[PDB]
């Protein structure tokens, strides 16, 4: 794993959010955006993914939360890699006292790992079957997609308490229609896959001219949504 940058809460610490960067990026660059947001009371933990051989890049190593081969809709899910990063995020979040609210967010591949974490919390276990140890208050995905949508129904249907957790967890999906890295249709299908499987508190915000990056109008919606769903 890479080097982590932590943004100290400027006011009364009430929530801790682990924010996951995109492919080839690092946590420090995201820490410098998050610390400009009008969000006191939130501690930002920005880790950096391991520089991992990426099959999409012909095996070239770079920072990645999980391995990706192929860009098609049928591509393999690196469940082992996603569970490892989800368990890593969970370990980071397990450092707070019990009264601190816990969330996870990310951009692109980091958004995918954040959304996958939310489905592990709903399922109550990782993809390998180990129990999920942390109580997530929310998750945010910017310009990403939902991994392991194929198995989401079977995982949620494993328990009535899984469906209860899925129905209450607030999820924010943001995507730009001009995105040429992660196509906008993946944002719509991730929202549809979540809603179809019991996640009844999913908000999907679209921006028509937004590409594969962030804009202040998008981040302003993130701030308002985080303020409301964290109290």
Author numbering: 19 to 249
Sentences from the paper on this structure:
Both proteins fold into a canonical α/β hydrolase architecture and superpose with a root-mean-square deviation (RMSD) of atomic positions of 1.54 Å over 210 amino acid residues. We found that a loop constituting the hydrophobic tunnel lid is the major component determining substrate turnover rate and substrate specificity.
Classical acyl-protein thioesterases (APTs) feature an active site accessible to the solvent and adjacent to a hydrophobic tunnel for accommodation of fatty acids attached to their protein substrates. The crystal structure of ZmB6T1C9 reveals exactly such architecture with a continuous tunnel stretching through the entire protein, allowing for insertion of long fatty acids and their hydrolysis by the catalytic triad of the enzyme. We determined Michaelis–Menten parameters for hydrolysis of a series of p-nitrophenyl esters and found stronger affinities for longer fatty acid chains with pNP palmitate binding almost 200 times stronger to the protein compared to pNP acetate. We therefore conclude that the phylogenetic clade containing ZmB6T1C9 represents canonical acyl-protein thioesterases (APTs).
